[PDB]
Amino acid sequence: LHFHYPIKGKQEPKNSHLVVLIEPKIEINKVIPESYQKEFEKSLFLQLSSFLERKGYSVSQFKDASEIPQDIKEKALLVLRMDGNVAILEDIVEESDALSEEKVIDMSSGYLNLNFVEPKSEDIIHSFGIDVSKIKAVIERVEHRIKETDHDQAIRKIMNQAYHKVMVHITKELSKKHMEHYEKVS
Amino acid sequence: VELHFHYPIKGKQEPKNSHLVVLIEPKIEINKVIPESYQKEFEKSLFLQLSSFLERKGYSVSQFKDASEIPQDIKEKALLVLRMDGNVAILEDIVEESDALSEEKVIDMSSGYLNLNFVEPKSEDIIHSFGIDVSKIKAVIERVKETDHDQAIRKIMNQAYHKVMVHITKELSKKHMEHYEKVSSEM
Numbered sequence: 001l002h003f004h005y006p007i008k009g010k011q012e013p014k015n016s017h018l019v020v021l022i023e024p025k026i027e028i029n030k031v032i033p034e035s036y037q038k039e040f041e042k043s044l045f046l047q048l049s050s051f052l053e054r055k056g057y058s059v060s061q062f063k064d065a066s067e068i069p070q071d072i073k074e075k076a077l078l079v080l081r082m083d084g085n086v087a088i089l090e091d092i093v094e095e096s097d098a099l100s101e102e103k104v105i106d107m108s109s110g111y112l113n114l115n116f117v118e119p120k121s122e123d124i125i126h127s128f129g130i131d132v133s134k135i136k137a138v139i140e141r142v143e144h145r146i147k148e149t150d151h152d153q154a155i156r157k158i159m160n161q162a163y164h165k166v167m168v169h170i171t172k173e174l175s176k177k178h179m180e181h182y183e184k185v186s
Numbered sequence: 187v188e189l190h191f192h193y194p195i196k197g198k199q200e201p202k203n204s205h206l207v208v209l210i211e212p213k214i215e216i217n218k219v220i221p222e223s224y225q226k227e228f229e230k231s232l233f234l235q236l237s238s239f240l241e242r243k244g245y246s247v248s249q250f251k252d253a254s255e256i257p258q259d260i261k262e263k264a265l266l267v268l269r270m271d272g273n274v275a276i277l278e279d280i281v282e283e284s285d286a287l288s289e290e291k292v293i294d295m296s297s298g299y300l301n302l303n304f305v306e307p308k309s310e311d312i313i314h315s316f317g318i319d320v321s322k323i324k325a326v327i328e329r330v331k332e333t334d335h336d337q338a339i340r341k342i343m344n345q346a347y348h349k350v351m352v353h354i355t356k357e358l359s360k361k362h363m364e365h366y367e368k369v370s371s372e373m
Binding site: 027030085090094095107110111115131133 | 215217218271272273275277278279280281282283292295297298299301303312313314315317319321
């Protein structure tokens, strides 16, 4: 399990804009172990915090849009809420052709949405989606049939790629150019 | 809008072609936003309709709820075991900013994916997998104020049910099954 994406920005200086970061709510389907869901949500929660601190923002963590005191509301630039799901489907066959061997795979479906919310009216001003589907892991190949991994290990291969891609897409959307534009439109 | 898990199987009944297919009850997971009864009724409709489609196409159809309930007598005689797994999830409260032509709108939107497995009955070997992507189905809930969530869920699910039945019915054509029959013959 590698729910870590390294952050390579420089330490930017305090820009005095404060962002509210809500714990992401990512549903999973039954074949994914519960501990992975919490690992995944806990990693995105802290890693986006670091990343936002690293870019000059200060961060109020909450775990629900309920908590949020009218205090923090009156001050914060925006709230960042992530919701969605990841599911894993098992035992899909891809048949052989001239170049490729026949394979049994696991494969994801699912989607993650990140809302940009104004703290007072609670209006969503913008939504950014990451598609996390069609990430594949090979469990058997036919060369003699050969087992490559067990199921749990496919689940893991797939969650890591998914985590990664999410963190890559999100960190890229939250650039300075985008954020400063956000501020002005508001 | 009311639930509508029914696709009209239009077509002449076909001379009984003598092949038997085993149909297993579809396993379709759902996310928290969708009532369990919708899942059940979505799984039940696909099951009966696929039996009706098959029969109307000349096959004998044997129904079971799990592959383990298939008796040897059946395994020995069946052409094919069809076996559907997947999920459908609905995401709520996605905004689509306005532009020159369209008002700003808030929507609900699906994700998920269905997989139909084609299985050789004796060995239990999967021979072929056919997928239907059911993601990116949208319902508008608010314009800058159309509906609420449960009504949008109903619409999205109907559109997903329609898409599954159309893709599978076209996948399980006479040309494809005869081809599949020939392919096992050699195998």
